[PDB]
């Protein structure tokens, strides 16, 4: 088709000569300014009502989102829907602006179809992100009713002495613009902000961020997720799972990078520090999903992330647990016509195995 004639052109031509000529963070930033220009290949694919879910309050017209990191200040939003996908995340966005690690902080491992980053929460701070937010609050509010939620990602300063703060000060400040609300608790790029996963201080956390999110006006008050780590402990996400459900918190999201280092890995820059992400973290991903999922008894929505770069990877985290799914790394390799092969092939597949549609196949492993 066109759609497999640009899926094609962009993953063995256009990506790896641009990906050639351009040192990867220069490459992140010319990515973010042609999504905010619209400069990109027509999204072919028109989602059909089979790719509709519905959780955490919302419509989503389909379950491919983009992942944290990609859009870190929200400059590249109304880009991000035209590429396709069914919601955008933004941030992480700190408290104030920060600059984040010295430069090279990113690095491309090709052999692995991954990458590795430090950005170190690298913010324009929540006031600039407030404001550009501002700009098109109406704007979002249709693309919300019309299926296309919007989530934001809050981090905590550097210097910050007291991590709750930063977060409720996240939640005063962009909870008003978001549909859901991300507590990142598991960079691996930030000294002791894993620590924040630990059972008595996310019980503490994630109580303080409640409280602020419950004093909003009702038609401004998000969903809480929490962002969790792919290297917890078996005793960590019992934990996690405990205080979830003790606490009401709306969804996980399912994970994050991985500070662990996978046995094959080939690029030359596997050893640089840094979460990984990409096709070696896939399956890490998958499992954690599957044992969130279990430890919540499908109660708590899920948003899977890691190592998507095709329907069958989408499918996979759905069947595990997933309710949605995010990607980043795959649109490193393949640019923007991934997405309407994520969700064409998910498409398929979910005819091909007996589903009515994306509802009827999460968490579906789990009844086998
Ligand atoms: C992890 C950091 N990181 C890296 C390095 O590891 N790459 N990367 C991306 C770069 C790109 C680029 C680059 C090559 C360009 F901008 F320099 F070309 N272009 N495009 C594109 C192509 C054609 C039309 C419209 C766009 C947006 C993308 O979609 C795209 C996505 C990305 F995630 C990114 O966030
Ligand atoms: C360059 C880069 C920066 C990231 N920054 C953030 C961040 O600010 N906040 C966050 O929650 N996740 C961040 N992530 C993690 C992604 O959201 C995602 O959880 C992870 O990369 C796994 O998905 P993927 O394999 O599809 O990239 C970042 C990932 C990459 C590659
Ligand atoms: O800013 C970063 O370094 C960053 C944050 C995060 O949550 N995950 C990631 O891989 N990097
Ligand atoms: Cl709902
Ligand atoms: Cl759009
Ligand atoms: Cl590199
Ligand atoms: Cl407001
Ligand atoms: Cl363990
Ligand atoms: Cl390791
Ligand atoms: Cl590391």
């Known amino acids: 088709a066109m759609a497999t004639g640009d899926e094609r052109f962009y993953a063995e031509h256009l990506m790896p000569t641009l990906q050639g000529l351009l040192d990867p963070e ?17 999204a072919r694919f028109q989602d059909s009502d089979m790719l509709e879910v519905r959780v955490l309050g919302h419509k989503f017209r389909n379950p491919v989102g983009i992942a944290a990191g990609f859009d870190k200040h929200g400059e590249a939003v109304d880009g991000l829907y035209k590429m396709g996908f ?83 000060e996240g ?107 990409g096709k070696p973290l896939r399956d890490l991903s998958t499992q954690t999903i599957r044992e969130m999922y279990a430890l919540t008894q499908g109660r708590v929505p899920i948003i899977g992330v890691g190592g998507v770069s095709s329907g069958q990877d989408a499918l996979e985290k759905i069947r595990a647990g997933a309710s949605l799914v995010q990607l980043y790394t795959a649109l490193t390799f393949w640019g923007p016509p991934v997405v309407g092969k994520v969700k064409r092939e998910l498409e398929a597949l979910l005819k091909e195995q007996g589903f009515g549609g994306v509802t009827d196949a999460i968490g579906a492993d789990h009844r086998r």
Not at 26 to 42: D, E, I, M, Q
Not at 127 to 149: F, I, M, N
């Open 171 to 277: 939640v005063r400040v962009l909870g008003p613009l978001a549909d859901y609300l991300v507590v990142n608790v598991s960079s691996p790029n930030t000294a002791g902000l894993r620590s924040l996963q630990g059972k008595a201080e996310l019980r503490r956390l994630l109580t303080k961020v409640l409280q602020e999110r419950d004093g909003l006006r009702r038609v401004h008050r998000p969903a809480v997720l929490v962002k969790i780590a792919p290297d917890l402990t078996s005793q960590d996400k019992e934990d996690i799972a405990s205080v979830v459900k003790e606490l009401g918190i709306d969804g996980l999201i399912v994970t994050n990078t991985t500070v662990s280092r996978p046995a094959g890995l080939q690029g030359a820059l596997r050893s640089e520090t840094g979460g990984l992400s």
């Open 86 to 168: 069914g919601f955008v995340e933004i941030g992480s966005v700190t408290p104030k602006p920060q600059e984040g690690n010295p430069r090279p902080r990113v690095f491309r491992l090709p052999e692995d179809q991954a990458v590795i980053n430090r950005y170190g929460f690298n913010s324009h701070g929540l006031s600039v992100v407030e404001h550009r937010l501002r700009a098109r609050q109406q704007k979002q509010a249709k693309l919300t009713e019309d299926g296309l939620p919007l989530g934001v990602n809050l981090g905590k300063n550097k210097t910050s002495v007291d991590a709750a703060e930063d977060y409720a």
């Open 26 to 42: 220069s490459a992140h930033r010319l990515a973010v300014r042609f999504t905010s220009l619209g400069l990109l290949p027509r």
